[PDB]
């Protein structure tokens, strides 16, 4: 009934990322490896599309981006109006994302928004940075857009990773990318997801397998 | 012995773009040729060509009122072109110092392509006065697209060899944002118009 976040080992099996070994490393006896190539592909697909104007985003990403721009520019009423109109209209059927249009139009070219957009190359890494910035004005909890979880899972988990230390595996690639753009000091179109692969490798090494489980791995 | 910039008709011929309507233009193929002119996306100055890197740094130096750093780059590139191969690395210290300067960050934010970024660097450099091509003549043999693109900045109309990126450059400015989707339709329109103006040489072969 309730969508549960996957653990590292569940994520790895679901995407067929577990590998036998070849070459004997101490402390790591009955343990699986990671298919690096495959893991890269999967984390790269998590990254999603390039930012290329707010109007090419999904309505969700566009609507929520508007809310965070509103907060960045100290306009709580505009932010709150959106969130309220989306709640009203979620009771009966589909959220009315179009209410975000005046706000986006008003703030997308504002100075704080431009600064964020210039730092990030992907829809997900921009909107993540918009949330972070919006939180310098107040709380902006995920509870205010609870409807997003059923709707768009990746966006939900990326937004809930903002301000945490460790990501959900579902969004480990865009999380890794986001912090790499922050460390490099620039937007990066080339994926920078090595951290998500190391974290995965490390978390897999924590799990002893049985003989039968080991037999099941392929090379 | 001298590279002459192609006319819009010679350009059309070189790339098999003339058809029966007045000639007409093959729209699909022209779109493909203007898109190829756009070149690679910007994704850090370290991925640029050596010449694009060095000349971006000169322009960053100037934007940041630093004529002596711009002049040393150009001076070195000149002296090492007497001999043989330019030593483009002389601009590593300037790049490093200026790439995150505020003025450079405003420019880089507005443009998604190497050629549209550098084009706005040159334009910004000119807020500090004259930045003529005369000070990098070595480029014309080395890299004609870059050469012609920097000589079109400030001008009403581009050479056809760089009309894609020039078009995309003005589109980005008009949209107010960088655009990864190419916006080269105006290069197609200008090439259509310039072909129509020339009168057909009757007895032609065409498709």
Residue numbers in the entry:
A (entry chain A): 158 to 180, 185 to 380
B (entry chain B): 158 to 178, 192 to 377
In the authors' words:
The T4BS secretion coupling complex of L. pneumophila comprises the inner membrane AAA+ ATPase DotL (IcmO) and two inner membrane/cytoplasmic components, DotM (IcmP) and DotN (IcmJ).
Binding was abrogated in M1, M2, and M4, indicating that these Arg patches are involved in binding of acidic Glu-rich peptides. M3 and M5 were unaffected suggesting that they are not involved in Glu-rich sequence binding. To ascertain that the observed binding deficiency in M1, M2, and M4 variant proteins was not due to folding defects caused by the mutations, these three proteins were crystallized and their structures were determined and shown to be virtually identical to the wild-type protein. Thus, the mutations do not introduce structural defects, suggesting that the ITC binding results reflect an effective role of the residues in binding. Two were successfully obtained (M1 and M4) but attempts at introducing M2 failed for reasons that remain unclear but could be due to a destablization of the DotMLN coupling complex resulting in activation of processes that are stressful to the cell.
